[PDB]
Symmetry: C2
Subunit: 447 residues, 2 copies
Amino acid sequence: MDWKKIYEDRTCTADEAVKSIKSGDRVLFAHCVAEPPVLVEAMVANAAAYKNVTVSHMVTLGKGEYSKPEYKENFTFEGWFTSPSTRGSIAEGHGQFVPVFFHEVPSLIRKDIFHVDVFMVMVSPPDHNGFCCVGVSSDYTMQAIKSAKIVLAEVNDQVPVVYGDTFVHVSEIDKFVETSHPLPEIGLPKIGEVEAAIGKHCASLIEDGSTLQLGIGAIPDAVLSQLKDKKHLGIHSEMISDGVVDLYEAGVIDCSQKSIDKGKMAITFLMGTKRLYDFAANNPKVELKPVDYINHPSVVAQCSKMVCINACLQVDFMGQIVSDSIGTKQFSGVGGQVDFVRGASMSIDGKGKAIIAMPSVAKKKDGSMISKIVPFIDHGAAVTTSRNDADYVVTEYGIAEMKGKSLQDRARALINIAHPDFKDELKAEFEKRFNAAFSAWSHPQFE
Amino acid sequence: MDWKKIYEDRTCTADEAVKSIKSGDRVLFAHCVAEPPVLVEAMVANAAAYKNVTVSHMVTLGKGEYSKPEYKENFTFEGWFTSPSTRGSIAEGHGQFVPVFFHEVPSLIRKDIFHVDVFMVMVSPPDHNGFCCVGVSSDYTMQAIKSAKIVLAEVNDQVPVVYGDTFVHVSEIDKFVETSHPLPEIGLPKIGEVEAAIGKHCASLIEDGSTLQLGIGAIPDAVLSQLKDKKHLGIHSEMISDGVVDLYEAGVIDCSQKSIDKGKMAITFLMGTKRLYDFAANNPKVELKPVDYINHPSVVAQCSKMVCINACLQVDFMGQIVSDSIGTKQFSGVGGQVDFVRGASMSIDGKGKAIIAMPSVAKKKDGSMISKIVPFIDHGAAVTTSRNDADYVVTEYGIAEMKGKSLQDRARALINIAHPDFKDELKAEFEKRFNAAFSAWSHPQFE
């Protein structure tokens, strides 16, 4: 109606739209799959128009061109979660990294700590009432829309309409750039015997009626594959994957025993194949909500029989968990790992569990093996899940309980699930670290 | 009535009471000032009767005799927060340490992770209706009374009656041992120029009507002494000490602008001089509540203009905060530090602040001067407040903001508040760590 005039008046080309960015601006992209590639391309192509423009976002499936050293006078990448195409800049020094809990991002936007001069977002074209849909992200995207000084939208008719807090009226957007292209996809991972074993251990901790949080990759896919005997599972998760769709259509996940958002998979973003995007579209069983709801520890605490499944990179004898860095090298980010660990620990029913899982070993490129159960974290590594936060740790060799357990008993339990080849070296490190014998037993049979 | 017969039938000597403990038991002492010294003495005296009795508690003002190596066949100390009289056992190998958030202790007891066979607590003699008062502790003490298989009470008529969740009916207690002795006291700290400077910086962050959390020692006392010009301050704190009483008597703290528990100082335990214990007694302005209320991040989040002040030991370039260990040596515990950090971060009003403060330098055992602002944490140190949790860091040289700040900008801010004598060495380390100059500026003047 009146809105159609607004929409038409504000429609332009991508090259025109990015002229609204000025030197010194803080620019933010919509999260993950909602990043607008045509707008990002235009901004990068217009690099010489800009001096010292901050570019922030979290995980990206895009090229991360603005993060390359040649652009360092034009753009400064400020990642809140890094990925293969942007992590190089952080290692090299011209890119920056902010450690921030995923649930807290909207708060930092509202507080103007994460000030947003220009927000760039991909959306569906408007419905009959002038509401566009973000489709695949709610997360921090919805707050950014409200708080940004200028919102630039790539209107892509391949974006799905998904229920929840995903809608933005055309009157809230400054410029529209019309496009049509498929959304980025991630492939399904290969599951090895190591991951299969991890999934089986994780599955043994999951009872009927559990509310699940899990991500993407071989580990959560392995877990899901081992849940086919379970009943009435629910979802309250930062994201769902293609794997969750499989378990839903197997009849295992039905959200019938949830305490809040009953009958619905409650999520904050989507990332997978087009099969996932199609599933989520116009589906009463799926609802996207902002990250300061979904990942809020006080909200997770209200979930029934919460089971949160997340991966790490290494765990030390004290139960310090490193998940986002290898020594001084930054790889990803905390994301929602600690949000859900905390929510499960705070669970009002007292039934919440947080599982942190990893292969027990890695093969280095020189051919040698290394233990991911370690006496000490790598030099300069960031602790992601602190020793006080730690709950269950799982490898292909079993389950170690950290919660309420002493440093010595944590180390004993971790060594017990370490690779057999490393156990003697690790027990020697135990004795040096703790000034105590590994074995708590002492049988008179052995003098 | 009926109750008087119960009480009299269950009254006995300390030596008789401790025969309720058997080999293999988990024994728990009431927190801090409520530890029953006459019962502890009797237990240690009866050491030869016991094999492998676990002895747990948090901070202690007692002698910690059961933690000495000569007792290792009889007792195993399991600290949930260590102190000078028990920390030696952890370093030596025969004492154990559990990393646990203060607010979570009641939950672990309820879950039977912290199973309690015998709980030993000091209480006031019963009121007219048969209710004894813990007086100085609510914390985990109230849950432990409910959950323990057996409760042994030292009935000390010098224990104050203090309002809140501090009362236990005689029918809840198995044995009573009558005594009369003063409660343990801690001294008033000496405030040097360094702590006075820290206090001034912290005070500059505190507005009228703020709700405060702070502990004991030169830093919090220095902060309080700089608050004389503030108005309508409130208290929602793990503890109060003598300094808070001073500020209340000055009319600065009146609890008149609190959002919850209006007009009352809400606390979980008391530790100070007899002046504090007398003050808190029968006082409508003071209320003790358990730690899963007071320190619960979801409760702290409801507080108005929350300002949380806590101390640390060292902070690295990433904003990782070490507060409870010196390298591999365990010193204290997380206590409620992270509980209040998270609560302030989660504040519903968006006004919460968490301040972590420390002197910029220390003199080590060998007489050398060291920076407490460091490129990397000491080898094997536990991260107390993770980089994602970090908010304000304060030294005598000023304030550094961590929240929403990049690793590089955090390190710059921290170097800015380091001791002038260390700044150049620290900037050299900055360059090596980040591959960037401390000044992010290159000028054609110098090519």
